[PDB]
Structures are given as structure tokens and as C-alpha cells.
Design an enzyme around this catalytic site. Sequence first.
Site, PDB file in Angstrom:
ATOM      1  N   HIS A 139       0.810  -1.211   0.000  1.00 28.62           N
ATOM      2  CA  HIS A 139       0.000   0.000   0.000  1.00 28.62           C
ATOM      3  C   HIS A 139       0.838   1.254   0.000  1.00 28.62           C
ATOM      4  O   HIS A 139       0.395   2.255  -0.495  1.00 28.62           O
ATOM      5  CB  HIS A 139      -0.922   0.071   1.201  1.00 28.62           C
ATOM      6  CG  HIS A 139      -1.766  -1.169   1.379  1.00 28.62           C
ATOM      7  ND1 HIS A 139      -2.773  -1.499   0.530  1.00 28.62           N
ATOM      8  CD2 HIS A 139      -1.711  -2.179   2.325  1.00 28.62           C
ATOM      9  CE1 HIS A 139      -3.337  -2.655   0.927  1.00 28.62           C
ATOM     10  NE2 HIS A 139      -2.681  -3.078   2.018  1.00 28.62           N
ATOM     11  N   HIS A 152       5.650   6.989   6.513  1.00 32.61           N
ATOM     12  CA  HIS A 152       5.339   6.618   5.140  1.00 32.61           C
ATOM     13  C   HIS A 152       4.819   7.806   4.430  1.00 32.61           C
ATOM     14  O   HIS A 152       4.708   8.912   5.052  1.00 32.61           O
ATOM     15  CB  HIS A 152       4.285   5.519   5.141  1.00 32.61           C
ATOM     16  CG  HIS A 152       3.054   5.922   5.888  1.00 32.61           C
ATOM     17  ND1 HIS A 152       2.931   5.755   7.213  1.00 32.61           N
ATOM     18  CD2 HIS A 152       1.917   6.553   5.458  1.00 32.61           C
ATOM     19  CE1 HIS A 152       1.719   6.205   7.597  1.00 32.61           C
ATOM     20  NE2 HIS A 152       1.131   6.741   6.525  1.00 32.61           N
ATOM     21  N   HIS A 193       3.671  10.951   6.517  1.00 33.51           N
ATOM     22  CA  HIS A 193       3.055  10.731   7.814  1.00 33.51           C
ATOM     23  C   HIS A 193       4.088  10.180   8.790  1.00 33.51           C
ATOM     24  O   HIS A 193       4.627   9.065   8.555  1.00 33.51           O
ATOM     25  CB  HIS A 193       1.785   9.857   7.728  1.00 33.51           C
ATOM     26  CG  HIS A 193       0.618  10.551   7.119  1.00 33.51           C
ATOM     27  ND1 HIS A 193      -0.393   9.909   6.451  1.00 33.51           N
ATOM     28  CD2 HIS A 193       0.277  11.904   7.122  1.00 33.51           C
ATOM     29  CE1 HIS A 193      -1.295  10.798   6.027  1.00 33.51           C
ATOM     30  NE2 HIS A 193      -0.867  12.030   6.402  1.00 33.51           N
ATOM     31  N   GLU A 202      -3.672  13.566   1.523  1.00 38.83           N
ATOM     32  CA  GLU A 202      -4.880  13.003   2.162  1.00 38.83           C
ATOM     33  C   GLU A 202      -5.607  14.229   2.791  1.00 38.83           C
ATOM     34  O   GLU A 202      -6.711  14.535   2.364  1.00 38.83           O
ATOM     35  CB  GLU A 202      -4.464  11.971   3.235  1.00 38.83           C
ATOM     36  CG  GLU A 202      -3.783  10.770   2.604  1.00 38.83           C
ATOM     37  CD  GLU A 202      -3.998   9.495   3.408  1.00 38.83           C
ATOM     38  OE1 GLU A 202      -3.573   9.460   4.566  1.00 38.83           O
ATOM     39  OE2 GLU A 202      -4.576   8.518   2.859  1.00 38.83           O
ATOM     40  N   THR A 216      -5.955   6.609   8.493  1.00 32.94           N
ATOM     41  CA  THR A 216      -6.584   6.800   7.195  1.00 32.94           C
ATOM     42  C   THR A 216      -6.536   5.544   6.238  1.00 32.94           C
ATOM     43  O   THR A 216      -6.983   5.658   5.065  1.00 32.94           O
ATOM     44  CB  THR A 216      -5.946   7.972   6.427  1.00 32.94           C
ATOM     45  OG1 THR A 216      -4.598   7.589   6.173  1.00 32.94           O
ATOM     46  CG2 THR A 216      -5.962   9.296   7.283  1.00 32.94           C
ATOM     47  N   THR A 217      -5.970   4.428   6.702  1.00 30.65           N
ATOM     48  CA  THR A 217      -6.160   3.108   6.069  1.00 30.65           C
ATOM     49  C   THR A 217      -6.891   2.154   7.040  1.00 30.65           C
ATOM     50  O   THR A 217      -6.765   2.302   8.280  1.00 30.65           O
ATOM     51  CB  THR A 217      -4.817   2.401   5.753  1.00 30.65           C
ATOM     52  OG1 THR A 217      -4.045   2.255   6.961  1.00 30.65           O
ATOM     53  CG2 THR A 217      -4.040   3.177   4.754  1.00 30.65           C
ATOM     54  N   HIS A 245       1.824   9.195   1.195  1.00 30.01           N
ATOM     55  CA  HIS A 245       0.709   9.001   0.244  1.00 30.01           C
ATOM     56  C   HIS A 245       0.971   9.982  -0.911  1.00 30.01           C
ATOM     57  O   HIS A 245       1.398  11.168  -0.676  1.00 30.01           O
ATOM     58  CB  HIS A 245      -0.688   9.253   0.869  1.00 30.01           C
ATOM     59  CG  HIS A 245      -0.941   8.503   2.205  1.00 30.01           C
ATOM     60  ND1 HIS A 245      -1.698   7.371   2.296  1.00 30.01           N
ATOM     61  CD2 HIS A 245      -0.495   8.785   3.494  1.00 30.01           C
ATOM     62  CE1 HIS A 245      -1.725   6.967   3.605  1.00 30.01           C
ATOM     63  NE2 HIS A 245      -0.984   7.852   4.329  1.00 30.01           N
TER      64      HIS A 245
HETATM   65  N1  LIG Z   1      -2.275   7.145   7.199  1.00 25.59           N
HETATM   66  S1  LIG Z   1      -1.960   6.824   8.904  1.00 25.59           S
HETATM   67  O1  LIG Z   1      -0.787   7.673   9.444  1.00 25.59           O
HETATM   68  O2  LIG Z   1      -3.220   7.152   9.653  1.00 25.59           O
HETATM   69  C1  LIG Z   1      -1.320   5.170   9.108  1.00 25.59           C
HETATM   70  C2  LIG Z   1      -0.715   4.840  10.324  1.00 25.59           C
HETATM   71  F1  LIG Z   1      -0.708   5.705  11.359  1.00 25.59           F
HETATM   72  C3  LIG Z   1      -0.179   3.581  10.512  1.00 25.59           C
HETATM   73  F2  LIG Z   1       0.314   3.310  11.726  1.00 25.59           F
HETATM   74  C4  LIG Z   1      -0.185   2.645   9.478  1.00 25.59           C
HETATM   75  S2  LIG Z   1       0.484   0.948   9.527  1.00 25.59           S
HETATM   76  C5  LIG Z   1      -0.662   0.204  10.625  1.00 25.59           C
HETATM   77  N2  LIG Z   1      -0.422  -1.065  11.047  1.00 25.59           N
HETATM   78  C6  LIG Z   1      -1.422  -1.442  11.892  1.00 25.59           C
HETATM   79  C7  LIG Z   1      -1.408  -2.684  12.527  1.00 25.59           C
HETATM   80  C8  LIG Z   1      -2.507  -2.974  13.389  1.00 25.59           C
HETATM   81  C9  LIG Z   1      -3.550  -2.004  13.593  1.00 25.59           C
HETATM   82  C10 LIG Z   1      -3.501  -0.746  12.967  1.00 25.59           C
HETATM   83  C11 LIG Z   1      -2.431  -0.478  12.127  1.00 25.59           C
HETATM   84  S3  LIG Z   1      -2.080   0.870  11.219  1.00 25.59           S
HETATM   85  C12 LIG Z   1      -0.774   2.978   8.283  1.00 25.59           C
HETATM   86  F3  LIG Z   1      -0.744   2.071   7.322  1.00 25.59           F
HETATM   87  C13 LIG Z   1      -1.321   4.249   8.049  1.00 25.59           C
HETATM   88  F4  LIG Z   1      -1.842   4.510   6.831  1.00 25.59           F
HETATM   89 ZN   LIG Z   2      -0.508   7.783   6.197  1.00 28.04          ZN
END
Ligand SMILES: NS(=O)(=O)c1c(F)c(F)c(Sc2nc3ccccc3s2)c(F)c1F
Ligand SMILES: [Zn+2]
Length: 257
Positions: A61, A91, A116, A103, A195-196, A93
Amino acid sequence: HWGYGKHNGPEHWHKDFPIAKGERQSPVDIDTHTAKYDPSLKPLSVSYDQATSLRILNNGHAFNVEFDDSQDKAVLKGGPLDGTYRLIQFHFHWGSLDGQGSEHTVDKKKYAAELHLVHWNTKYGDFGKAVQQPDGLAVLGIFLKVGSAKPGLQKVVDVLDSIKTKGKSADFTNFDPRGLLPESLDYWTYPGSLTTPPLLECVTWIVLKEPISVSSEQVLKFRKLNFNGEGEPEELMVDNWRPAQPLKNRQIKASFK
Ligand SMILES: NS(=O)(=O)c1c(F)c(F)c(Sc2nc3ccccc3s2)c(F)c1F
Ligand SMILES: [Zn+2]
């Protein structure tokens, strides 16, 4: 099965994760005129001098740069935050074109990309427990626009060919994430979610006002990545962002003006 294409993209997520239509979902559009300046918010504290990156991974992703979060090394604190939160990964987006990819949006403006930096609340002892808590995570978001190169991003861009396809990883040591910060730390802040999937409503969002610039060649290399694995028909890793979700009751606060 979830992803970013026609048949499994964000509009489909709620089938497997009904919190998708919940009351504190992310990202959102930041209406810069309805955000409330709050003179009582503290300066953000980004203490990244001791960060220890370990690995970069294509998870199918996005790509993650992972850090060793087993002691108090790279931490976020102050700002709107009550505890201290430990950096576990960052990471990005990004878009298929420079006109889209972020996002969060700012008065409907989409940036080319969004960084992020994901941190977890020390009082819950690890990331796995932190995500089940309403104040479990703090994510620092930084907008990217295309123009001048960010020298501090190039080591990231140069290793992406070695993690081309889903599942691939590579050692990624001594990467200093201070190289990705803009000059100012003025921010907006609001309560919301991953956001995933699993879309858990566990995140204090801290979004910096000042974007960083990256070159078109840097962002072009993000776009050579793949969603698929090494076995398979190439789907380029592009447009892995979720669009802005309803604000519902929430108030967005500003550190500035
Ligand atoms: N866009 S985001 O910063 O809100 C985000 C994140 F914080 C993350 F920490 C992650 S990786 C993730 N791994 C797990 C494993 C178990 C439960 C929730 C998450 S989120 C993620 F893919 C992501 F998109
Ligand atoms: Zn993110």
C-alpha cells in the site's frame, strides 16, 4: 483485499470496516478560516536527535521506513499532546500526477504528497495496544509540493528500486528524519483516525502549515513502485490516498495567528 483501485478503493472500505463512516474519520479538509487559533496550545516538541531507523518495506500500500521504538529515542511531545509519543515509522501518500496525492487538504487544495510520521503513546507500552485507545497515536503530517529537491529525502528515493514490489524490504540504517522537516512548526490539530484499514479512531492529527518541496524526479521515483508482488502483473503504486471525510462535529485548532 482492500486497496486503492476501482473495486477495492476507499469507497468500498466500509464493507469490511464499518468505522469508515464513523464520527472521527480522517483525513479532512482543513478550512483555514474556520480553524480556531488557540494561544493556549504549546510549541510542538520534535526530539529526533537519537532516532534509529532500521528497515524500509513495501507493504503493498505504501512504503514504510521503520524505527527502533524499544527505548525513548525519537519522541513527539507538547503541542496539543499530554503524554510523550514514540516514533515507530514514517510513510507517504502520493498521486499519479502532481495535482493530487495528499490526504489532508487546505481550503480544498490537494498537495502532490503527504508524509506521515507515526508515533505512539508511551503510556500504553506498545503500538499494538496504543491503536485500541482514543489517544493512542499522534501522527505528524507534512505536505509535499513539487519544486526544489529535498536533499534530506534522497537516500529514501535511491533505495526504492530495491523494494519494488509488495513484500520486499531492505536494511535502512542511520536515516535522519530531521531532514524531512520544514523550517516552521506552526500546525493545525484535530481528533481523528488511521486513514487506512482498520481505520481505528485513535489518532491525534498534527498537520504542519508549511509544506516541504521535493523535485519532480524525486516524486517520479515514488511512482515507479508497485502495489503487486514480484510474481505479478504490474500495477504502479500511485494514488494511495484516502479522500477527505466529513468533519462532523469536530473543531480544528491552530497553533498560529
Ligand atoms: N495514514 S496513517 O498515518 O493514519 C497510518 C498509520 F498511522 C499507521 F500506523 C499505518 S500501519 C498500521 N499497522 C497497523 C497494525 C494494526 C492495527 C492498525 C495499524 S495501522 C498505516 F498504514 C497508516 F496509513
Ligand atoms: Zn498515512
